[PDB]
Amino acid sequence: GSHMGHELAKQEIRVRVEKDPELGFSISGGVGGRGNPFRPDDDGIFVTRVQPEGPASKLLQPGDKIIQANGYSFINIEHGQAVSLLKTFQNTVELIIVREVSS
């Protein structure tokens, strides 16, 4: 796993980002996708950057794993599909994320 001999606690969190009109964060990942620096063997979609003083600054953090966005599943999704879907979203994006919480 990502950590040697232990696994961090996980919290599922629901947040709403108001696009302004941009997301205010960047992603990487996906099945057969661009990878990620958090859980490198996990093919999920991860937040890689959060725009300072942007619409996600109080809500998201690097390393958050997006598992659902506006009712669409981001599990087994490809990078391009995730990017395309996020792009179609006009204003509010309701995300379900998994955040690792160190002890």
From Swiss-Prot:
Domain of life: Eukaryota
Compartments it resides in: Cell junction, Hemidesmosome; Nucleus membrane; Basolateral cell membrane
Known tissue expression: Highly expressed in brain, heart, kidney, muscle and stomach, followed by liver, spleen and intestine.
Coiled coil: none
All residue ranges annotated as the PDZ domain in the record: 12-101
Subunit structure: Interacts with ERBB2, BPAG1 and ITGB4. May favor the localization of ERBB2, by restricting its presence to the basolateral membrane of epithelial cells. Also found to interact with ARVCF and delta catenin. Interacts (via C-terminus) with DST Isoform 3 (via N-terminus). Interacts with NOD2 (via CARD domain).
Task of the protein: Acts as an adapter for the receptor ERBB2, in epithelia. By binding the unphosphorylated 'Tyr-1248' of receptor ERBB2, it may contribute to stabilize this unphosphorylated state. Inhibits NOD2-dependent NF-kappa-B signaling and pro-inflammatory cytokine secretion.
Similarity comment text for this entry: Belongs to the LAP (LRR and PDZ) protein family.
Entry protein name: Erbin
Species per Swiss-Prot/TrEMBL record: Homo sapiens (Human)
Gene: ERBIN
